[PDB]
From Swiss-Prot:
Bridged cysteine pairs (disulfide): C138-C161
Binding positions for substrate per the UniProt entry: H69, S70, R71, E72, R127, N144, R145, S197, Y198, Y248
Gene name as annotated: CPA1
Name recorded for this polypeptide: Carboxypeptidase A1
Enzymatic reactions: Release of a C-terminal amino acid, but little or no action with -Asp, -Glu, -Arg, -Lys or -Pro; leukotriene C4 + H2O = leukotriene F4 + glycine
Localization: Secreted
Enzyme Commission number: 3.4.17.1
Annotated positions binding Zn(2+): H69, E72, H196
Classification of source organism: Eukaryota, Metazoa, Chordata, Craniata, Vertebrata
Length: 307
């Protein structure tokens, strides 16, 4: 509430608290953390990115987004925890410190603010955006099927009323296009991590196609390493692989896009749990989730700094 050291990371928060949090952090670490507004949501809400940087030019950067699907509360929660952790770990952990001395981190805690607010206000299990309009009474797009990455192919629905609606055209959703522009403009993203829940997976491209990425040996071994790292804290067991092989065909995803932009280290996480609680993961599992998922993320970041 009054500082980041006072903020309760062991409970779920509303939009206002998370935004206020972003302010506390910037005020507390002005030299390390910048808050960027890369857009406005459908309903006019600021869309915020925290930039972690130790200086430099347009340093190679890591993208991390969380909460694109609004009901996956664990992701927005982890996202706050990560932001704190960056500020804590800088100069303490030799490994993290070497990362930030050379690379920037862009962290998007609430990718889908409208959906988030709606999860608090009306429907806890809402996952889409809240864009309206057309020949429908149904609101919102699945923002993780809206990307220009086999957009409108099988693995996404052309019904507005669908929970997996892909939207009218690739990048129709402002929450998406804001990221696109942002990353395309920067031009020096080396890794790109989208954070989801649940089912305990680490995935690399493709979803939309059976085609094997050229970098699959490398991405596989990376995925292996990060899953090993993650399981070291509490024993939490992930599976890993390409989306289409592990999960299902899915078109218009985050990772397919970024990898097609030449960002090689394009990974999606699906956090806890395995179905016991689902989207409604107990607040008592926030910190343990955040802590292990850090070890998984750190691993990738390290690989990245290294190649
Ligand atoms: Zn999701």
């Amino acid at each position: 509430a009054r500082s980041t050291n006072t903020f309760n990371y062991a409970t779920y928060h509303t939009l206002d608290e998370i935004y206020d949090f972003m302010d506390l952090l910037v005020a507390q670490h002005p030299e390390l953390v910048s808050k960027l507004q890369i857009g406005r949501s459908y309903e006019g809400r600021p869309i915020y990115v925290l930039k972690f940087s130790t200086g430099g030019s347009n340093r190679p950067a890591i993208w991390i987004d969380l909460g694109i699907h609004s009901r996956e509360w664990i992701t927005q929660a982890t996202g706050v925890w990560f932001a704190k952790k960056f500020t804590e770990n800088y100069g303490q952990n030799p490994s993290f410190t070497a990362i930030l001395d050379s690379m920037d981190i862009f962290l998007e805690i609430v990718t889908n603010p409208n959906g988030f607010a709606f999860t608090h206000s009306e429907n806890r299990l809402w996952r889409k955006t809240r864009s309206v309009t057309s020949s429908s009474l149904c609101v919102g797009v699945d923002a993780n099927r809206n990307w220009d990455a086999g957009f409108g192919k099988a693995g996404a629905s052309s019904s507005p009323c669908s929970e997996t609606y892909h939207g009218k055209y690739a990048n129709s959703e402002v929450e998406v296009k804001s990221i696109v522009d942002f990353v395309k403009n920067h031009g020096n993203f080396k890794a790109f991590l989208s954070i989801h829940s649940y089912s305990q997976l680490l995935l690399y491209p493709y979803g939309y196609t059976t085609q094997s990425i050229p970098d699959k040996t490398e991405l596989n071994q990376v995925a292996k390493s990060a899953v090993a790292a993650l399981k070291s804290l509490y024993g939490t067991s992930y599976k890993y692989g390409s989306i289409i092989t592990t999960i299902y065909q899915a078109s218009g995803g985050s990772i397919d896009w970024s990898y097609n932009q030449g960002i090689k280290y394009s990974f999606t996480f699906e956090l806890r749990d395995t179905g016991r609680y689902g989207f409604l993961l107990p607040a008592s599992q926030i910190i343990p989730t955040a802590q292990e998922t850090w070890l998984g993320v750190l691993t990738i970041m390290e690989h990245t700094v290294n190649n």
